[PDB]
Structure 1
């Protein structure tokens, strides 16, 4: 599997519902949904080490990790967390997150490379799953 690429979003489902679970108010939810229709994920993969840059029009952030090694990032709604990525299969990884301070919904994400050349990213907060689909530029 080679996740490396400049990925462009083509589909985003249930993102507003995810943000609702996370306590984002309705107006900012709609604005965030609009930002998601634009956004890109750049991946550089070397073996089990991943460099990921997620960007929208006005914001960019970097996720760096090695599979199986704890690291710190933020949840979708922006709360700092400790994260651990594991493979679920040849082409799919899963990340469990634990809040660094306080409580909140159980969050996680997955990244999958399909046989058709798509990247599928899911983000979960409790029972609500957002699914996002990208293609390479």
Structure 2
């Protein structure tokens, strides 16, 4: 069939590294791109095509119990070992990540249909808002 309509989820991706290198994509980009999976939405009407591509990476799960310290390696980010302790302050979930970096941690809380997340390291604060889907 010529009908390529649909949502397509990447199963395999061989020699993406060599293709990207032949395009002169730089090392640090290739290092990340080779880890992604791709979803392709093809909307086809006769010979008219619309391609919609999203690229995706799954991070490692994190499992913990409130009140019991656990070891973390932040492979997702700086790949450091921290000793993380999560506690409740009211309805605010508070994590201190004990390690090399000062004042490293986060706070998480629900307000309405929004989840608020405040990441901290040193004097820097990053504020993220999520919507319940």
Distance 2:93 2:129 in 1: 15
Distance 1:97 1:104 in 2: 9
Shift >4 Å, 4+ stretches? none
Aligned to 2:117, which of 109, 121, 124? 121
**Paired position in structure 2 for 1:15:** none
Distance 2:63 2:81 in 1: 14
**Paired position in structure 1 for 2:106:** 109
Deviation at 1:83, TM superposition (A): 0.5
**Paired position in structure 2 for 1:93:** 93
Higher RCO by CA contacts (8 Å cutoff, separation 6 or greater)? 1
- Normalising by structure 2, we get a TM-score of 0.53
Deviation at 1:122, TM superposition (A): 1.0
How do 1:1-137 and structure 2 match up within 5 A? 57-75=56-74, 76-89=77-90, 91-99=91-99, 103-114=100-111, 116-137=112-133
Q: Deviations over 1:93-132 (max 9, x none)?
A: 1100112xxx333311111111x21101111001111010
Long gaps (5+) in structure 2: 1-27, 33-54
Distance 1:58 1:93 in 2: 25
Root mean square deviation of aligned Cα: 2.3
**Residues 107 and 73 of structure 1: CA distance in aligned 2, closer, same or farther (over 3 Å):** same
